[PDB]
Amino acid sequence: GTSQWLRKTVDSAAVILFSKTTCPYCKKVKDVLAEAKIKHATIELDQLSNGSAIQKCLASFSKIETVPQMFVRGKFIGDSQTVLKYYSNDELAGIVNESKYDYDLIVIGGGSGGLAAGKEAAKYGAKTAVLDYVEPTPIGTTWGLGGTCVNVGCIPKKLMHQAGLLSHALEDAEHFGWSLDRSKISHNWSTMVEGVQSHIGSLNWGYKVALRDNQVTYLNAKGRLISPHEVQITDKNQKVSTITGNKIILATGERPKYPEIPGAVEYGITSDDLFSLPYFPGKTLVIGASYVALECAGFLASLGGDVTVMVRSILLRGFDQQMAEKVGDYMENHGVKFAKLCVPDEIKQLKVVDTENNKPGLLLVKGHYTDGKKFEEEFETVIFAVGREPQLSKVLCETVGVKLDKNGRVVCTDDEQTTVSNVYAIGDINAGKPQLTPVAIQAGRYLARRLFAGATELTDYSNVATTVFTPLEYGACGLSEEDAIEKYGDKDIEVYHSNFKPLEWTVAHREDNVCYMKLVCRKSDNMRVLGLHVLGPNAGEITQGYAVAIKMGATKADFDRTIGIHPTCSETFTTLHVTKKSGVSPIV
Amino acid sequence: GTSQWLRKTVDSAAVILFSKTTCPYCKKVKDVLAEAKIKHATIELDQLSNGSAIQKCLASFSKIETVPQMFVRGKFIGDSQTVLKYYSNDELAGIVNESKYDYDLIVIGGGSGGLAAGKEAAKYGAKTAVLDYVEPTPIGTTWGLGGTCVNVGCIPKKLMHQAGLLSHALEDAEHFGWSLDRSKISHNWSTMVEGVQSHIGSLNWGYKVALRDNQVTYLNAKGRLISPHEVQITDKNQKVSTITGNKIILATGERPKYPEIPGAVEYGITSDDLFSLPYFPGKTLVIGASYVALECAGFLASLGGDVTVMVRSILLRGFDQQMAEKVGDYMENHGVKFAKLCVPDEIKQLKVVDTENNKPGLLLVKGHYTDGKKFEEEFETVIFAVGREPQLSKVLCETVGVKLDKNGRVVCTDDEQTTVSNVYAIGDINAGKPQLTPVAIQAGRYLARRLFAGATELTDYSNVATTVFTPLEYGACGLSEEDAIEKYGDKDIEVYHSNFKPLEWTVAHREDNVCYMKLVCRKSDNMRVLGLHVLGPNAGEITQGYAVAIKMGATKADFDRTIGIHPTCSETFTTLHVTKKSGVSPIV
């Protein structure tokens, strides 16, 4: 059992030292490597259980049973005297640099998972390249290093969400005694875009500095895997070349889809364009009903826009539908309009974007409702949020042999391995995994440690908590109510729930019975918490701590016996008692 | 062991039905019982693992072994046939109202614990009186039903904290693109107090309605326990009378202390007065360094006041001192002045309070620093926050036999029982317990269930989480870092820590490395999390969820394997890696 772990670690590591904490001969070698500025993995054999068995099994590669032993790319290099002989003869640097390949690791894609995989691999001596290239949108929008979240995703959207929230802050301040007139204050879109884009630019720059200070080679070029170990690159001048790597990580992400209808690509935009748009969108139509669509429609309305959402069927497909409907009712009562059971047919241009004076165009949208009735209205901006997809034909040559699924995502084992033994995939293109930035970052960091440091820890993809940052935020961990009932049967499911009102909302005269939370529990398993759901302010900060308890198997009793922090919204989870089966009202 | 429980349940329960879930004869009794508006506990013997043995032991009381069995105040009443006979003969109401005492329960104190104990007892048929009286402050301040938190504690102070937070919201709004000018906006204290007091008034009313809807007798009179079952009441006309009860719950809380210096009582105020003060305090001296003192100074400063805190020795004695100092430093960087190592000697009056034109007076404060140098300065308002204390001498005739510790608090067993077998104590006066509203509420509700419904669950007072609502909030759960080291030794303690910056602070140009969090772990117990500490916005919402995981025995590995929610502050707890031993900087 242990023998095949050691073969795997020795064959994959770039520079690895087998050591012991107590040994000073090991200390002698560590310092030689530190002074020579050689980075490497170290496996302190006294700090592991089967450590005495590994010391003996090392001899299969080296013919010695003692410590230290140093390896470079699968090859035994020496004990303390032999490495010191290489240092003293200036043979060391050429030994640790000799490789069959240009790089130990090539990462295709410089986003959340790719940059994390890259930086972590370089820590343990892997010679690493990171490739990133941002294909422009149809109107030519492009951005810097860091991926979807940093440039056109979580970071800009939560910053605009905050701008929206500050509007109700201004309203609330009058009731708390501040002398301002909310009625006489307006919002400047381009001022906000300049602040958001300036922060994004400091992140582009930070990532490039991080790569340089880890000796990671960053190539702003489009990557294409033509064979298991060969990557073809194409730079800004359209110059083609080929580099080789031992291990390959695909981390190229996704991009927004367009519907197959006239005018969409020509006259619409997507979220890729929204976050650096130079003019205010004006009267906007959002087509779609995913979290992206609702989040954007949500802050556009809070900033003062005339906003409409076109919903084919339901909101937030895949999420708990009671919570989804409460999310949607809140938005509808605070000035988002909904065109229900409606799909688009064409977009007609009426005015071209006034690019000089910084103004939007004018469009005609024509569609029909699900019964047959017709839709026709004019908008200044149309935003499509109808899903995202990878396009691995751009990245991946079919002859290489990497299996994809029917959606176009990479089929992987539970350690991210593809059907080609040295190629891996992480992040949104890994089939079946939650498409979330913290997931990609963990997957990337954990894989790098297994490749180049002898680690065994895998990424746990179950019960990952989410938050939808609509004007009233919605946090969740675990199963929706309908999924629990389906998997276990309604007679085994108990649901504790309650409305609540933040203390902050009392003096501000906000609504009484709009915030809501519930625990979905399995009776036959000690009333285990199957899913947690909360609609209210700061839902992400509320939910996050409970994801730890859910990972650990929390039960209703665990929540009961824990004491609240007062006054908070979150404490309401510690005294839930009304069940749905009882019929009692959840109001306060 | 099972027989000792049954004898205790039968003796103290007011009205209790022994039953089985599927039992048409039991259902026949239940329908008679609540038709006549008779509240009662019910124990469904088929829901307990040793319900077979319990059913037998009932015969020691009734001479029968079947269900249903109905008891009133320790006396067996009958089976199905017997109870119905009493019903159709109009004898039943007189049976269930038969008592040696006026009340099954007398609660002394109408605050967090007492209201919660009383309402819960009444649900199971206990005849209940709740006594509450508010001794006016030296200047005459008084308030309504609900206790310290509702009237002069958590509720008014967090509303005022929120008023203070809204000032940085208005500042942050400009950077996010709103057109207002923060420097042209001022705060109106009396407008804020009016809104706060109107919300407090609606809580006062809501509690009176809740007691009436539960058939609890509310007496607005001061109570005094003259013998184990005898309570002397004095009403608002000084009429004196005596009521008896079977069980007595003491829940009278504490009040603010005054230092024994000239002018303190005469010319200063406490928090009891601050939350309904008709005029803005103006230039203010806060004397003390507890969380009350720091919280009040904190929002006074955010609302535009000139504020000084006089600190005898250290900030937040009893909390983790590295966190206390970071809390202090932030306040001092945001306009709170500190007079360190200093104590007051006397307050002298320069102007009487102008009650007509609604203005504070003027005071001269004189004191000294620990090295002997002199303090002398003028202030409009002086607020004493130098601790709180009970005064059970005005509650407890010494001859009754209730033992007290050296601080004046009631020594109780771990089921809240005092040295007199039918008297219990809950809330702030229970010696050695955390002094917090959720603790009082939970202790009161669980005690009621044990007295009157046969419950056995005890209140768990370990690892109760806290939040200090200073201008930058500080949430904690478990041991301080210095306590962990003292109990286990520095060599067995490992601390993971990190700075962070809320995403909301980027565009608003706020501080880079002020927010801070750490996890205090025990190496020899599989890196068990001993204490969690976070300084930052929404610290209470952040901390609460983690209290469940700490209750469950969480380890560093459990935090590591849980994925974060992005973008949130709380997610930083899921990727901590820098140790204090390592000497690496916690900046980002």
Ligand SMILES: Cc1cc2nc3c(=O)[nH]c(=O)nc-3n(C[C@H](O)[C@H](O)[C@H](O)COP(=O)(O)OP(=O)(O)OC[C@H]3O[C@@H](n4cnc5c(N)ncnc54)[C@H](O)[C@@H]3O)c2cc1C
């Ligand atoms: C509007 C929006 C909001 C979101 N909000 C959140 C949120 O609040 N929280 C959250 O957890 N997640 C959020 N997400 C999802 C999150 O952004 C993704 O899960 C994450 O970015 C995926 O990381 P990745 O490393 O798999 O891919 P990416 O971050 O997309 O990185 C892939 C990178 O590789 C580049 N690339 C592609 N092909 C090539 C090639 N051939 N050669 C070189 N480079 C290439 C891409 O251009 C891109 O730079 C949001 C997404 C969107 C669209």
Ligand SMILES: Cc1cc2nc3c(=O)[nH]c(=O)nc-3n(C[C@H](O)[C@H](O)[C@H](O)COP(=O)(O)OP(=O)(O)OC[C@H]3O[C@@H](n4cnc5c(N)ncnc54)[C@H](O)[C@@H]3O)c2cc1C
């Ligand atoms: C400024 C301040 C802020 C606080 N903030 C928080 C916070 O954020 N979170 C938190 O958890 N805790 C907070 N606390 C603490 C919280 O208020 C107490 O822990 C809690 O109220 C204790 O409840 P109790 O039932 O023990 O006492 P109380 O709530 O004080 O109730 C006792 C009641 O009995 C009355 N009484 C006294 N003697 C008699 C008598 N002889 N007859 C009749 N009635 C009598 C008293 O007047 C009072 O109304 C704060 C306290 C203060 C002072």
Ligand SMILES: CN(C)c1ccc(CNn2cnnc2)cc1
């Ligand atoms: C002693 N055990 C474990 C027990 C006994 C009775 C009940 C039901 N009566 N009740 C009401 N509120 N809590 C309990 C539940 C548990």
